[PDB]
Amino acid sequence: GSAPKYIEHFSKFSPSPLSMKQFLDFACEKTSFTFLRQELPVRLANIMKEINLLPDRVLSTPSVQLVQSWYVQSLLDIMEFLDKDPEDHRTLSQFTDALVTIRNRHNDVVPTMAQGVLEYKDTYGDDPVSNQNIQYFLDRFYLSRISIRMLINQHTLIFDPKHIGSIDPNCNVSEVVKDAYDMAKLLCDKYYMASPDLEIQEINAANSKQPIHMVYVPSHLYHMLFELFKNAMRATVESHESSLILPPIKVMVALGEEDLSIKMSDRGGGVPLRKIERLFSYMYSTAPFGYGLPISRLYAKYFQGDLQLFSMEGFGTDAVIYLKALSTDSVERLPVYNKS
Numbered sequence: 220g221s222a223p224k225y226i227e228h229f230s231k232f233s234p235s236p237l238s239m240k241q242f243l244d245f246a247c248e249k250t251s252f253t254f255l256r257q258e259l260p261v262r263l264a265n266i267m268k269e270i271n272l273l274p275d276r277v278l279s280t281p282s283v284q285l286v287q288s289w290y291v292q293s294l295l296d297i298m299e300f301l302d303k304d305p306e307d308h309r310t311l312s313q314f315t316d317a318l319v320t321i322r323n324r325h326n327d328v329v330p331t332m333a334q335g336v337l338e339y340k341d342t343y344g345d346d347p348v349s350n351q352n353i354q355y356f357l358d359r360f361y362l363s364r365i366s367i368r369m370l371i372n373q374h375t376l377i378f379d380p381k382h383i384g385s386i387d388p389n390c391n392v393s394e395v396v397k398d399a400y401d402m403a404k405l406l407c408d409k410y411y412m413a414s415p416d417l418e419i420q421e422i423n424a425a426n427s428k429q430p431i432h433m434v435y436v437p438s439h440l441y442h443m444l445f446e447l448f449k450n451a452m453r454a455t456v457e458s459h460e461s462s463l464i465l466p467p468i469k470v471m472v473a474l475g476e477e478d479l480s481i482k483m484s485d486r487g488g489g490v491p492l493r494k495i496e497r498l499f500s501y502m503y504s505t506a507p508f509g510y511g512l513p514i515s516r517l518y519a520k521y522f523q524g525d526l527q528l529f530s531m532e533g534f535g536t537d538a539v540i541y542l543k544a545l546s547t548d549s550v551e552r553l554p555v556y557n558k559s
């Protein structure tokens with residue numbers, strides 16, 4: 220086979236970050252086909268190149284071998300279409316199916332990689348240097364993965380109208396906050412037979428009246444807000460088991476010139492500063508609902524945002540999602556394979 224030759228050719232190319240604006244502008248299905256059948260190989264190859272740079276003791280583990288096998292099939296699957304003629308509506312139709320199969324195939328990367336982290340901890344240990352390499356690698360791996368799922372969702376959802384695939388051009392942030400809250404409350408009520416209440420305050424700096432809307436991927440925002448709610452609810456409930464009042468969870472949505480910021484404040488009794496970093500560590504949060512904190516932060520970073528935790532041991536925790544207010548500043552943040 221040629222998979223290694225392909226990986227070498229396509230890893231010569233840099234991934235092309237698109238903006239929210241460019242994503243919404245979707246030109247025709249043929250444009251998406253001819254863009255993607257180049258761009259997906261570039262993005263697959265860049266991350267496969269990086270997997271191959273992992274030391275042999277990591278590389279040879281069944282879990283890494285398995286997801287490398289998925290990535291090779293998916294690259295190969297897309298090659299088939301490189302010669303093919305767009306115009307032919309049966310080339311375009313067959314490509315959509317190929318994306319849908321690829322998306323399926325990769326659904327279990329996260330628990331599959333988690334198993335590799337787990338057997339590394341037992342086989343080689345949980346020293347801080349191992350922690351930094353796991354963290355370095357998986358942040359890039361997962362961000363690459365988020366970026367590929369985004370391209371594929373956008374193609375399959377549009378070529379099968381207010382929403383534009385996964386993108387809401389008029390996303391009401393408070394509505395996504397209530398959705399994530401209600402789902403977290405549902406689970407929290409089930410498991411704990413008590414749930415904190417929600418208060419939302421909005422701060423539209425420029426337009427103190429207007430409800431805060433934005434161009435975003437509401438699924439991504441829901442993933443992050445859901446994780447933050449799980450954390451704030453488990454914390455607030457368990458900190459107050461011997462108590463009768465449950466302090467609410469307070470979310471502020473602030474819109475500035477540049478930042479749309481979403482703070483979730485709880486009185487869960489908080490975390491010592493020393494233990495905050497571990498909450499973002501893939502290795503330290505591997506023990507044996509929601510994507511985890513490390514991955515929630517990647518969704519924030521994906522469009523030039525961030526997710527930060529600040530706690531007050533003895534009181535509780537603030538979690539802030541920072542998004543770009545403006546769709547022009549909302550550009551894919553892609554890990555690129557270079558000398559570094």
Ligand SMILES: COc1cc2c(cc1OC)[C@@H](c1cccnc1)N(C(=O)c1ccc(O)cc1O)CC2
Nearest residue numbers: 447450451453454457458485487488489490536538
């Ligand atoms: C199981 O009960 C507790 C679960 C959690 C906390 C406290 C719980 O008991 C009282 C608490 C924590 C995390 C790590 C170490 N010590 C405390 N957590 C946080 O402060 C926290 C972290 C992130 C976030 O978005 C919101 C939060 O309130 C979370 C986990």
Ligand SMILES: CC(C)c1ccc(COc2ccc(CC(=O)NCCN)cc2Cl)cc1
Nearest residue numbers: 273274277332335336339349352353356357
């Ligand atoms: C299963 C996945 C998530 C996984 C599990 C475990 C790891 C751990 O990866 C390590 C651990 C130690 C070192 C030090 C070293 O010797 N450096 C030389 C290598 N440049 C490098 C790497 Cl890439 C990564 C990814």
